[PDB]
Amino acid sequence: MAHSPPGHHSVTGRPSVNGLALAEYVIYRGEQAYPEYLITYQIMRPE
């Protein structure tokens, strides 16, 4: 695992081409996230 850039606690990847995309994020210490909900699903074939 790398480190956060100096003076920061995470990285934000801002979408900069595809205008529909939401942001993605990176943390560099496991203790900065808690796996709160476990969701069981299937993807659905479009009709």
Binding site: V11, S16, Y25, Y28, Q42, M44
Partner: protein, 161 residues
């Protein structure tokens, strides 16, 4: 120390988590290659993950971040999809769960789009798809994602494609 508590579909907490899952699906630039072709999900179950030690580990770090950032943890709820989902819920996130080759370096990645995290459920690039059918677009097999509480604190902004 982990126990899983099922939420009823009538429960408003079920309903708000399902809505965040469904409403953040988008189309992807691989045309469905990694995660499959779909506009929505069939949600089979939502479970609350309870582990006191893992929660206290999280809140302890949250407080540290918040004290480094004018009492602002900058906490978000975000998706994570992983082959290691079963180890994460029992032992928590650690370096074994990092995307070593990710575009922002070796760290643990999270998405606002549920469909982006769905691309990593069977591995990087969707791996070889579901264990049973080898199909990255399998409509039969049951998948699991995490909806996670994430402390960002002061986040470095990277503009990117």
């Amino acid at each position: 120390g982990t126990i899983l508590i099922d939420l009823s579909p009538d429960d408003k907490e079920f309903q708000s988590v399902e809505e965040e899952m469904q409403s953040t699906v988008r189309e992807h630039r691989d045309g469905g290659h990694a995660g499959g072709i779909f506009n929505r999900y069939n949600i089979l179950k939502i479970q609350k993950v309870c582990n006191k030690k893992l929660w206290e580990r999280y809140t302890h770090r949250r407080k540290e971040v918040s004290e480094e950032n004018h009492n602002h943890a900058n906490e978000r709820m975000l998706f994570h999809g992983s082959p290691f989902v079963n180890a994460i819920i029992h032992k928590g996130f650690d370096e074994r769960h990092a995307y070593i080759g990710g575009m922002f370096g070796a760290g643990i990645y999270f998405a606002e789009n549920s469909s982006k995290s769905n691309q990593y459920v069977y591995g990087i690039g969707g791996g070889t798809g579901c264990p049973v059918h080898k199909d990255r677009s399998c409509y039969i097999c049951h998948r699991q994602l995490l909806f996670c509480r994430v402390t960002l604190g002061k986040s470095f902004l990277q503009f990117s494609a």
